[PDB]
């Protein structure tokens, strides 16, 4: 079983964070399974 | 109680496994991170290449370092929008200054130019990015250290004295292994006493050992059930030491969260709820703050009036008369 691990996105409001949330999400499932 | 926005998304690499969370707005990063609500192995600083660092950029960094994230990956986003080479460099050199001010190797920091917009969109030339991303948090984030491979806390619930065996301490083992016949330290409030773990039972079930997640009762060798005192905790001896003195990150509820209707100013004696009980404690504000707002969250040293078994990390209550008004994280201990 694999390791987990606890991440999240910080940063200023409205520079991305919850895009970016969104895109890895995508293109790691596109890419990987 | 604490109003708090976040979102949970999980996600594969092909070798681990992610928990992700996002909040919405500023106070929502502040609520959250201290009250560990959403604690993070490793963070992702996101920062527009367009608009460069800001203030929450900083204060963000700031509170990592506060409640203790240990990792940053810094992603410059909105590059599909700048074109100087130049202008990148320029950001990039400023966040590592930055990252660098608080105490983060701002050099070897990975930083991703990419385009979370576009890759969004299926443009599979900044996908890549998000790919390069993803290769940074496999390799850069260490594999985080599991609660049983910790040293032994547990944190007495309750005691008991179950005739002609002895004194019984009950609770849940926070972190780490007891094996029957293992020594153990009790710390905190009176002087740190040892003594032996002479068994482990669980609803009359009697065991080998307690584990990381169970709630045990946990029996010692010769110490009198009167000589533990509520605040107290079980640990691998020399693994915890008990401290007074400590520094602190703390968000102050504000009304609406059912916390204080006025501030209070230099000279506010509160209790400090640390696992199980309430320890009065002295407080110092930074120079210039004369008075602490509902809602506001503060650098805070603070002087507890018996000593209390705690490490860097360790959160915390604010309570006034029972009622919770503000929630901490112990910084860093100073004595
Ligand atoms: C266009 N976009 C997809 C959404 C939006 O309309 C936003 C806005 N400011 O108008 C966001 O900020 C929006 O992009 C955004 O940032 C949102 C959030 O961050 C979250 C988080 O982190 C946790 C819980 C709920 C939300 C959320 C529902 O407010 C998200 C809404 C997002
Ligand atoms: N051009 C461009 N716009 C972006 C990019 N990422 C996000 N945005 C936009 O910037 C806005 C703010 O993004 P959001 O993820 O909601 O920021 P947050 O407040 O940090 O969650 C959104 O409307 C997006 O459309 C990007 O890479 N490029
Ligand atoms: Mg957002």
Redesign the pocket.
């Given at each position: 079983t694999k390791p987990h691990v606890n991440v999240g996105?910080i940063?200023?409001?409205?520079?991305?964070?919850?895009?970016?949330?969104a895109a890895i999400t995508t293109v790691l499932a596109k890419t990987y399974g | 109680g604490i109003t708090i926005n976040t979102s949970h998304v999980e996600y594969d690499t092909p070798t681990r496994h992610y928990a992700h969370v996002?909040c919405?707005g500023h106070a929502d990063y502040v609520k959250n991170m201290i009250t560990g609500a959403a604690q993070m192995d490793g963070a992702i600083l996101?920062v527009?290449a367009t608009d460069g660092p800001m203030p929450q950029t900083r204060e963000h960094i700031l509170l990592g370092r506060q409640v203790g994230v240990p990792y940053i990956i810094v992603f410059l986003?909105?590059?599909?929008?700048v074109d100087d080479e130049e202008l990148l460099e320029l950001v990039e050199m400023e966040v590592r200054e930055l990252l660098s001010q608080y105490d983060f190797p701002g050099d070897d920091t990975p930083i991703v130019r990419?385009?979370?917009?576009?890759?969004l969109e299926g443009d599979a030339e900044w996908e890549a990015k998000i790919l390069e991303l993803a290769g940074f948090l496999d390799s850069y984030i260490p594999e985080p250290e599991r609660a049983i491979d910790k040293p032994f806390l547990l944190p007495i619930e309750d005691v008991f004295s179950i005739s002609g065996r002895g004194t019984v301490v009950t609770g849940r083992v926070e972190r780490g292994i007891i094996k029957v016949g293992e020594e153990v330290e009790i710390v905190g409030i009176k002087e740190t006493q040892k003594s032996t773990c002479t068994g482990v039972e669980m609803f009359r079930k009697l065991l080998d050992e307690g584990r990381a997640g169970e709630n045990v009762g946990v029996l010692l060798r010769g110490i009198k059930r009167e000589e533990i005192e509520r605040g107290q905790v079980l640990a691998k001896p020399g693994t915890i030491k008990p401290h007074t003195k400590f520094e602190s990150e703390v968000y102050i509820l504000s009304k609406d969260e059912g916390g204080r209707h006025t501030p209070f100013f230099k000279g506010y004696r509160p209790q400090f709820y640390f696992r199980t009980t309430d320890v009065t404690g002295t407080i110092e504000l930074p120079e210039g703050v004369e008075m602490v707002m509902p809602g506001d969250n503060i650098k805070m040293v603070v002087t507890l009036i018996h000593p209390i078994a705690m490490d860097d990390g360790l959160r915390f209550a604010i309570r006034e008369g029972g009622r919770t008004v503000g929630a901490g994280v112990v910084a860093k201990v100073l004595g």
């Amino acid at each position: 079983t694999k390791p987990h691990v606890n991440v999240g996105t910080i940063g200023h409001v409205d520079h991305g964070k919850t895009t970016l949330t969104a895109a890895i999400t995508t293109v790691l499932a596109k890419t990987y399974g | 109680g604490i109003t708090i926005n976040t979102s949970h998304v999980e996600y594969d690499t092909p070798t681990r496994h992610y928990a992700h969370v996002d909040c919405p707005g500023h106070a929502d990063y502040v609520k959250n991170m201290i009250t560990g609500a959403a604690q993070m192995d490793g963070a992702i600083l996101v920062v527009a290449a367009t608009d460069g660092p800001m203030p929450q950029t900083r204060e963000h960094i700031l509170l990592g370092r506060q409640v203790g994230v240990p990792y940053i990956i810094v992603f410059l986003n909105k590059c599909d929008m700048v074109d100087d080479e130049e202008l990148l460099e320029l950001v990039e050199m400023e966040v590592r200054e930055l990252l660098s001010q608080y105490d983060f190797p701002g050099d070897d920091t990975p930083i991703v130019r990419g385009s979370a917009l576009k890759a969004l969109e299926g443009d599979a030339e900044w996908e890549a990015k998000i790919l390069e991303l993803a290769g940074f948090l496999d390799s850069y984030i260490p594999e985080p250290e599991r609660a049983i491979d910790k040293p032994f806390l547990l944190p007495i619930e309750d005691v008991f004295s179950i005739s002609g065996r002895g004194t019984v301490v009950t609770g849940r083992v926070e972190r780490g292994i007891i094996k029957v016949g293992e020594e153990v330290e009790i710390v905190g409030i009176k002087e740190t006493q040892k003594s032996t773990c002479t068994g482990v039972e669980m609803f009359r079930k009697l065991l080998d050992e307690g584990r990381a997640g169970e709630n045990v009762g946990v029996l010692l060798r010769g110490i009198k059930r009167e000589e533990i005192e509520r605040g107290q905790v079980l640990a691998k001896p020399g693994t915890i030491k008990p401290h007074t003195k400590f520094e602190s990150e703390v968000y102050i509820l504000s009304k609406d969260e059912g916390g204080r209707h006025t501030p209070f100013f230099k000279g506010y004696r509160p209790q400090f709820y640390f696992r199980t009980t309430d320890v009065t404690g002295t407080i110092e504000l930074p120079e210039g703050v004369e008075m602490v707002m509902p809602g506001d969250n503060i650098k805070m040293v603070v002087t507890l009036i018996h000593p209390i078994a705690m490490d860097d990390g360790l959160r915390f209550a604010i309570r006034e008369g029972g009622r919770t008004v503000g929630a901490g994280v112990v910084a860093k201990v100073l004595g």
